[PDB]
Design a protein around this motif. Structure first.
Motif, mmCIF file in Angstrom:
data_model
loop_
_atom_site.group_PDB
_atom_site.id
_atom_site.type_symbol
_atom_site.label_atom_id
_atom_site.label_comp_id
_atom_site.label_asym_id
_atom_site.label_seq_id
_atom_site.Cartn_x
_atom_site.Cartn_y
_atom_site.Cartn_z
ATOM 1 N N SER A 77 0.843 -1.187 0.000
ATOM 2 C CA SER A 77 0.000 0.000 0.000
ATOM 3 C C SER A 77 0.877 1.235 0.000
ATOM 4 O O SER A 77 2.055 1.177 0.349
ATOM 5 N N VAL A 78 0.269 2.361 -0.355
ATOM 6 C CA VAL A 78 0.955 3.647 -0.354
ATOM 7 C C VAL A 78 1.465 3.986 1.037
ATOM 8 O O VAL A 78 2.618 4.404 1.204
ATOM 9 N N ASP A 79 0.623 3.827 2.062
ATOM 10 C CA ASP A 79 1.038 4.181 3.412
ATOM 11 C C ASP A 79 2.205 3.309 3.880
ATOM 12 O O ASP A 79 3.112 3.793 4.573
ATOM 13 N N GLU A 80 2.188 2.021 3.524
ATOM 14 C CA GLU A 80 3.289 1.133 3.886
ATOM 15 C C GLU A 80 4.570 1.532 3.167
ATOM 16 O O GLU A 80 5.664 1.482 3.753
ATOM 17 N N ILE A 82 5.459 4.555 2.233
ATOM 18 C CA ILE A 82 5.994 5.741 2.889
ATOM 19 C C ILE A 82 6.669 5.347 4.198
ATOM 20 O O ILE A 82 7.787 5.775 4.507
ATOM 21 N N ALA A 83 6.003 4.507 4.979
ATOM 22 C CA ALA A 83 6.563 4.106 6.277
ATOM 23 C C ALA A 83 7.886 3.366 6.113
ATOM 24 O O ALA A 83 8.816 3.538 6.920
ATOM 25 N N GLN A 102 -1.112 8.157 -7.787
ATOM 26 C CA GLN A 102 -1.435 8.038 -6.383
ATOM 27 C C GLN A 102 -0.604 8.947 -5.499
ATOM 28 O O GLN A 102 -1.081 9.380 -4.457
ATOM 29 N N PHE A 103 0.640 9.223 -5.894
ATOM 30 C CA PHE A 103 1.495 10.040 -5.050
ATOM 31 C C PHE A 103 1.417 11.523 -5.370
ATOM 32 O O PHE A 103 1.816 12.333 -4.528
ATOM 33 N N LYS A 106 0.145 13.950 -2.761
ATOM 34 C CA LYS A 106 0.963 13.971 -1.562
ATOM 35 C C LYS A 106 2.324 14.605 -1.798
ATOM 36 O O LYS A 106 3.118 14.715 -0.850
#
Ligand code: NAP
Ligand code: FOL
Ligand code: MN
Ligand code: MN
Ligand code: MN
Length: 159
Positions: A77-80, A82-83, A102-103, A106
Motif C-alpha cells: 500500500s501507499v502508506d506502507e 511511505i513508512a 497516487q502520489f 501527496k
C-alpha cells in the motif's frame, strides 16, 4: 517530503510496451544525481522494466502480491511504502503511471524532464493542475552527439 521524478515526451507520454524507447544519457545522469542516497518507490511494472536494483538507493516496490526478490523491499500500500522509507528528508517516487497518480496529491516537488520527442505511448504522466505549482529551476539543452533530442530539466514546487 515526497517528490516525483519523471521524463515526459510530447503529450506527457512516459512509456510504451513497458519500456522507454528513447535514449538520453544526460537525463539518466540527472536521474541518478537526484535520486542517489534516497529511497525510491516504484510500481511493479517499472521494477520489471528497470530489471535490477538501483544501486545506492533503498528500492521499494509496490505490489499487491508477495515479493519475489529479497534485494528490494516489497510493500502492499501507499502508506506502507511511505513508512518503509523511515525518517528521511526526501522520498523519491520514480513511477510508473499508476504510481505517479497516487502520489501526486501527496507530493511537494516535481523533477520533470521535458523531452522534445514524439512518442507513441500507452502510459502518461498524470494531468496535474498548473496553478498548484511554481517553477523554481529550469535548464534547456539542445541535442548533441550523445543526446538525440532537446530537453528541459525543470523543478516545480507546490505553492
Ligand atoms: N519516463 C519515465 O519517467 C518513466 C518512469 C517510470 C516508468 N515509466 C514507464 O511507465 C510504464 C509502467 O507504468 P504503469 O503505470 O504500467 O505501472 P507502474 O505504476 O510501474 O506499476 C503498477 C503496478 O504497481 C502496483 N501498485 C501500484 N499501486 C499500488 C498500490 N497502491 N498497492 C499495491 N500495489 C500497487 C501493482 O502491482 P501488482 O499488479 O503486482 O499488484 C500495479 O499493477 C513503463 O512503460 C515504464 O517504462 C516511465
Ligand atoms: N528524468 C527521468 N529519467 C528517466 O529515465 C527516469 N526513469 C525512471 C524509471 N526507469 C529507469 C530506467 C533506468 C534507470 C537507470 O539505469 N539508472 C541509472 C543510470 C545512471 C546513469 O546513467 O548516469 C542509475 O544509477 O540511476 C533508472 C530508471 C524514472 N524516472 C525517470 N526520470
Ligand atoms: Mn491501509
Ligand atoms: Mn517517522
Ligand atoms: Mn526530437
Amino acid at each position: 517530503m515526497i517528490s516525483l521524478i519523471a521524463a515526459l515526451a510530447v503529450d506527457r507520454v512516459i512509456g510504451m510496451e513497458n519500456a522507454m524507447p528513447w535514449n538520453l544519457p544526460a537525463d539518466l545522469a540527472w536521474f541518478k544525481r537526484n535520486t542517489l542516497n534516497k529511497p525510491v518507490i516504484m510500481g511493479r511494472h517499472t521494477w520489471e522494466s528497470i530489471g535490477r536494483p538501483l544501486p545506492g538507493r533503498k528500492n521499494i516496490i509496490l505490489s499487491s502480491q508477495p515479493g519475489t526478490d529479497d534485494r528490494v523491499t516489497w510493500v502492499k500500500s501507499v502508506d506502507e511504502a511511505i513508512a518503509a522509507c523511515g525518517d528521511v528528508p526526501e522520498i523519491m517516487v520514480i513511477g510508473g503511471g499508476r504510481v505517479y497518480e497516487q502520489f501526486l496529491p501527496k507530493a511537494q516537488k516535481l523533477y520533470l524532464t521535458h523531452i522534445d520527442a514524439e512518442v507513441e505511448g500507452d502510459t502518461h504522466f498524470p494531468d496535474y493542475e498548473p496553478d498548484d505549482w511554481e517553477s523554481v529551476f529550469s535548464e534547456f539543452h539542445d541535442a548533441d552527439a550523445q543526446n538525440s533530442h532537446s530537453y528541459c530539466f525543470e523543478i516545480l514546487e507546490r505553492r
